[PDB]
């Protein structure tokens, strides 16, 4: 596993060398492929270095965030374009990729944590640094203070835990069944706001919105993630306590789940739109994780990487659009079909999947969530069926409003799609879909 | 220690007159130590070239010398009823000593003076008052042991300390309510230990020996001033500011470390309900931290340009540099510390 | 004079539960008036500066009777005396803040952030762990405190012996 | 004040000058080096003022060279735009945004109304600042006197009779008082001030004697604008300065004779001033013990720093002196990679300096 | 696009002496930035006596 | 009580003492005058204190050099008072 | 095993305070037997 690791440092000083933008990726693509071919992983851990390993579920988790952070530099080529401190900003990914790593091939649950939030203060330099809009700082606090709120907090859980255990090893936690009602809440409250849950949702809006188009990628692709990979950690040994407040978090997030899409089909901006879009996914991750039961452990393990990897394909495209039409209003951006017809075929795949479209790893995980929360309760048939209604409901609505009618009327000249953006956008739509010949290994990391 | 051999003597006698005070072995020698610390201080704290600053002398001798009065009341009364230095358990008598001396440190309850004296100090002055003048207060206290009064002041020093700050401009106002803060935890890991103490405060006295210098160096005394100031290179001047947040307590960087400390051990004491008034006003204090930073993180500015260069001392930028690249990169360095063990 | 609000079960000895937590309501009013009255509000007078005494803590003295009550009169009702309790307390309380404000809102919200801190307290009651538990652990050295000593006085001789007794 | 002809001779130092150039002095050089020892008769600060082109540079030369007097040539833009290797930073201008380009006294004379104007006036004050300042070090440090052409008190005056033209605005007024206020205080006021009143006629017809090419056909130097420098001079800055300086007035010492000149300044007298202590005539320089001279020593060898450093007042609600932060990122990618910008003067390979890897020093009161 | 910067209006909110202002706070100006405040010289009454004529 | 009876008046009359140092006199020497009379007071309890013991009273100079610097450093204050306000009431310092 | 141990070892001292590791506060009484010392000195030189 160091080998990552060191391959990572060693790289750092590539941001100070001046025209080594483009050769960053490569070497940032060529090391995905060389822990591409290191999977020989199981349920136990494996490949210990002195506190660092990974099974199955840390090796799918930490090989989106190398795939996902090496699309965050295809995608933000304004930042070279425009030498916008750039090295700066290579610094910022290459400091914030090294916290993910650590952060899920920590063996330790107080590691986790230490690197849990410690990835967030490079995030939250990304937003303010290279932000467009204003609103960028009314949305950096949120993001930071949302988090901070409700970690903090979850510090003094962790350590609760020693004094019981007198470890942090996930292994040697899972053999304690604890009965405390606070220590539940000092633990899934602040994963339950990272994931989001409908009702503390308020800051992710405002961050993707906000935050630039690498940050987007980021936001949306691992920070998400890291909630839903935290809750699989820590529910092992909180079976007995999720059994008396779980149906407060499944109707909530059921019920966030409808209530949203309803928002969605309400709103009238592209980043904002597929920002909603999140909650709307998250809600099922959530929900069939918190039913514990074999199928809604294994399918929200899928599902949290296939939404990643489309979400972030998502805000590629309004990157896109925004770039040229220069607003992300859905009223300017209509009738792209008939300005860059090419483009919108991406648009459409990586639409359909977010809308638990075949043959894509989306809708394997999506089948079992469902599974789980039905065997939960039959009463769960009712939103369900509408969650997954109104999830497409907003979803053509994104493509359709976007895509099909008559061209804008006040927009100026501007280019058409380039080779790089064709590029991105396979990368991110391409493997969704193989995924689905080999989910044998990122499915059953239990 | 900045101008005449004279500011050279009265640093010195501030040295002995503290050390005097915490290795005395009666209530009495204490005292003596802190009245050879007052008249050490003063001189250094007047200047006639400012109006604010005899003020500032001022209200430091006034609240200094009713502490040391009413902590000699109390030690006398102490030792009146139980003939030792020490009381086998503790009362009201204990109480009154324990008022003086928090006073005498400017905790939440007693603290106005402590603000309201920082408008017309330099800030070399506030840095010998926010870190060494805390010395010989705070460390007589782990000698009394009284829970309530003392927990009291905890719950307010954090709150006071964060609300108050979040509307202040003046650096040198604001950091005095960040200090307050600071001094919170102090004694919320006085209830516990005091090797924590002494950790926690090296590490606090460190980071605000280090803001201290930025603003000195530059001559900075309001927001305004951080984003007129001029830097060469953006990206120094945003590292610069990147320990605001190791004062924040962030674990990224180093000032989280003596936090981390301060909860691995209350934690263990089951001092549960405290550490969630604490760490969350944190965040308050955290806050206006952040504004500071409004200066470095966005990174292009409008800014006045009649000015081209920056004009800066070597010797205490030399050190200054020396001190942030820690502030920023010293958590590797925990294999090190054996103190905590 | 002197009542302790959890010497008996929760529905029991109303006048000694009214007396025990009208004591936290007076103290905290007179703590936070004594502060209103010199560094806030500055009356002018020996009359007003009463109605600042009375006014911070007259109602303050309403609402720790309020949820007395309730909570006392919730535990008979209902048949036990469980945490809902102490949330319908606190919703009195809550209550009592709006008339003292002439907020309706404030009295409602103020009333929820009243309500789930009784919960909690129940919690504790109930569970059997402390809110601000003495120390168990206190540390007074490092690892060398008996070690580390600097002095140069040379100390003269001992007065006791570790060993047992001659006699 | 005691010239050649009365020493019969060259200044003869009371104790050898301390390298202020290269060491420096701060409080613990200040217990072995005394300050006190090394003042004689000639250890005043002279202000050689007067219209513009009076003819003062001429005057000042032969006069600092009779009273074995430093003269310190007068600021000048270039010493902005020309770096310690030479090179021209105006010549980057074509790359720069307009509001960014450089401006000098050349297009102040051609294109007065230029709102960049305020920006220049601003600069004049701050580089008169700094060179005055070093005169203090020479003289504190060296106990020879020296001689100024235009101190920064002198500098409102131009300030101030540009704003009555109209070429400032209220705000660039209002911005340069807070600036004067926030560091005029912290200066040592000059010994003596000698001034050349050229009358207001005469001065126009010098300034074609130059002809110098902008100047004669420049507009600015009309009749309204000189005379509102000589109402300025008079009115404002002799009546205040003369409370603490003496003060010579002369028709124009450039037309006339120095030696003349040298003759009169001995025949004043300094000392009976000294002998109240509460005098304002030269009090900035009475300092009662020891103590007091090493302060000021250390203030201006050792703290010229942070004088420099008041000059950072936020003012933003003007909007000439605001600089667009969309410039500023450009400015600075040109200005600072250009030869020689890389680095501290002295460092910057590239311009031929050699031995980087062995070398460590930096120089003293030198920036960055 | 566009790009917002930390403009003038922006830091207006920092001007003052305070953030907040009220009528209270709103009244006071910003101290010397230099953080010196020169004493005001300020009249000067003298004792007198009619020393003499008894 | 063994307190009322022999260490009660001391005790009341230094809270009276701390009662006249707060008190709003126009005067800044309404402070000093005020600070060396509750000095005289913890004289007295102090002098209560060692003559409990035999032969301890040495440390009232002690006390008593300590007593004077701190009214001799308070007085020093009141003339850098002067010379920067003109004046040494209360109400001429800026309330912050 | 050990830090279940170790911590439970460290509540014994601090319990009851009778060990010179931690949870014990030096109390020297050499400055008292230096006055007694002092003072037997003192009883000697009395007299003239
Ligand atoms: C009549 C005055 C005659 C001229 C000044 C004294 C000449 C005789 C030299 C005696 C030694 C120095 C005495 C002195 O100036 O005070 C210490 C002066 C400063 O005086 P100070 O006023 O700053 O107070 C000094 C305070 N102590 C003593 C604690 C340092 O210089 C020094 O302190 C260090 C240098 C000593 C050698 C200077 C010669
Ligand atoms: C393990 C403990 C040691 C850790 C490493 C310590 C050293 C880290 C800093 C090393 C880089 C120092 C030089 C530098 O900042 O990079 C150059 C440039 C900065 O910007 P600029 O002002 O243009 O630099 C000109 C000098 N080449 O580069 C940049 O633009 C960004 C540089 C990174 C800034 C990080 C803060
Ligand atoms: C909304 C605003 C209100 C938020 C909630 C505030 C109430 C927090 C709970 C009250 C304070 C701490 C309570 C506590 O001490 O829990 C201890 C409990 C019992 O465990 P035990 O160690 O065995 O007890 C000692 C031996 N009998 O065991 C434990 O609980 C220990 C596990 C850690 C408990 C941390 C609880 C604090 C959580 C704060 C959340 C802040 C809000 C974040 C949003
Ligand atoms: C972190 C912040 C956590 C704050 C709350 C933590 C405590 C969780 C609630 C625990 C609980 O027991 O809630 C259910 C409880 C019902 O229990 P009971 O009082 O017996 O009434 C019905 C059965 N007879 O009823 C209650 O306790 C009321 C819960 C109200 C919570 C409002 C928020
Ligand atoms: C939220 C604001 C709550 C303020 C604190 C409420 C409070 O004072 O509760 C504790 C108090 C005393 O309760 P007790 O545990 O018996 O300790 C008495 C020791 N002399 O009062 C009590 O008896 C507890 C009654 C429940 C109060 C719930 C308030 C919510
Ligand atoms: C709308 C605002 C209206 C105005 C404010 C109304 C509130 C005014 C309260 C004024 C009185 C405050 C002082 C109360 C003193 C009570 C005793 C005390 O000092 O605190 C200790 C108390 C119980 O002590 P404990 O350590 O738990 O040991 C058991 C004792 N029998 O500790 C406790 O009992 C704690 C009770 C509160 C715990 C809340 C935890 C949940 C917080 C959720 C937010
Ligand atoms: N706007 C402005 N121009 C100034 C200032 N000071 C000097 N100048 C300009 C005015 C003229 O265009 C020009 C006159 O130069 P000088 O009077 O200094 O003559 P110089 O020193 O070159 O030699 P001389 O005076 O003849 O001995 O410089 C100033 O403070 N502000």
Partial sequence: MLKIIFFLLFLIPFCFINNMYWMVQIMMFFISFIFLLMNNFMNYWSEISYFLGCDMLSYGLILLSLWICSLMLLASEMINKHNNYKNLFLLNIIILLLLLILTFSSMSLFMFYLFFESSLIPTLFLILGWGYQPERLQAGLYLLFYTLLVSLPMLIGIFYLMNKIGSMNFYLMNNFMFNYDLLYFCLLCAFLVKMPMFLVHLWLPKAHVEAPVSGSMILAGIMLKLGGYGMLRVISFLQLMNLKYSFVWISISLVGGVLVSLVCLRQTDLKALIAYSSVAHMGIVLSGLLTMTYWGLCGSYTLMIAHGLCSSGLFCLANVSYERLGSRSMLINKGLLNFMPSMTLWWFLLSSANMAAPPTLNLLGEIYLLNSIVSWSWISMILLSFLSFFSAAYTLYLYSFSQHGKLFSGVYSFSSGKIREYLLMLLHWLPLNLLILKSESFMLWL | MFNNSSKILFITIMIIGTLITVTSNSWLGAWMGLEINLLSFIPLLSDNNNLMSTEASLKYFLTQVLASTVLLFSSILLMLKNNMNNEINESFTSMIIMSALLLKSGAAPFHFWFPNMMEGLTWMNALMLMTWQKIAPLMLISYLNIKYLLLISVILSVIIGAIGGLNQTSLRKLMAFSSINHLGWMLSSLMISESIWLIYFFFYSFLSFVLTFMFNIFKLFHLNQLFSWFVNSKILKFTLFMNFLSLGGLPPFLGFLPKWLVIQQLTLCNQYFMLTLMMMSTLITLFFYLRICYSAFMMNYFENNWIMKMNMNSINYNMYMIMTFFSIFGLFLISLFYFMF | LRSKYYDHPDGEDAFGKIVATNKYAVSAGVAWSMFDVLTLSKPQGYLPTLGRFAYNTGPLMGMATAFTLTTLVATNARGKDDKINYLIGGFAAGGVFGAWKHNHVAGLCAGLFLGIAGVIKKMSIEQGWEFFPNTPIKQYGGLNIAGNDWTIMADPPKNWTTEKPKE | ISGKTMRGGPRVPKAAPYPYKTKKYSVFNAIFDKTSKRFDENSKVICVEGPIAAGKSKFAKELAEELDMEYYPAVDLDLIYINSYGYDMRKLDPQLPPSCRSYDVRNFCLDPSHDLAAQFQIRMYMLRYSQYIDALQHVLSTGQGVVLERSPYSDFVFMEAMFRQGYLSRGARSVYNELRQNTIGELLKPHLVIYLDLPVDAVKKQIKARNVDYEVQSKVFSDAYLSDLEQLYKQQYLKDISTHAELLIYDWTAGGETEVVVEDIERIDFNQFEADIHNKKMLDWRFPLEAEWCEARIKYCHEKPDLMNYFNVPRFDVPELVRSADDGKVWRDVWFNAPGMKYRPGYNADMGDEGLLTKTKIGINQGI | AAKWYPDPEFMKQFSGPVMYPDEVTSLWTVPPWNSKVTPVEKSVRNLTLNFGPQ | ?96 | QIRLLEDEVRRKMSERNDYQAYYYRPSVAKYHRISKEAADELEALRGD
């Fill in chain 6, 1 to 96: 009580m063994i307190m009322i009876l022999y260490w009660s008046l001391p005790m009341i009359l230094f809270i009276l003492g701390l009662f006249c140092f707060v008190s709003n006199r126009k005067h800044l020497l309404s402070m000093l005058l005020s600070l060396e009379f509750i000095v005289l007071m913890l004289f007295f309890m102090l002098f209560i204190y060692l003559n409990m013991l035999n032969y301890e009273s040495y440390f009232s100079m002690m006390f008593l050099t300590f007593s004077v610097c701190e009214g001799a450093l308070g007085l020093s204050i009141l003339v850098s008072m002067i010379r920067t306000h003109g004046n040494d009431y209360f109400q001429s310092f800026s309330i912050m």
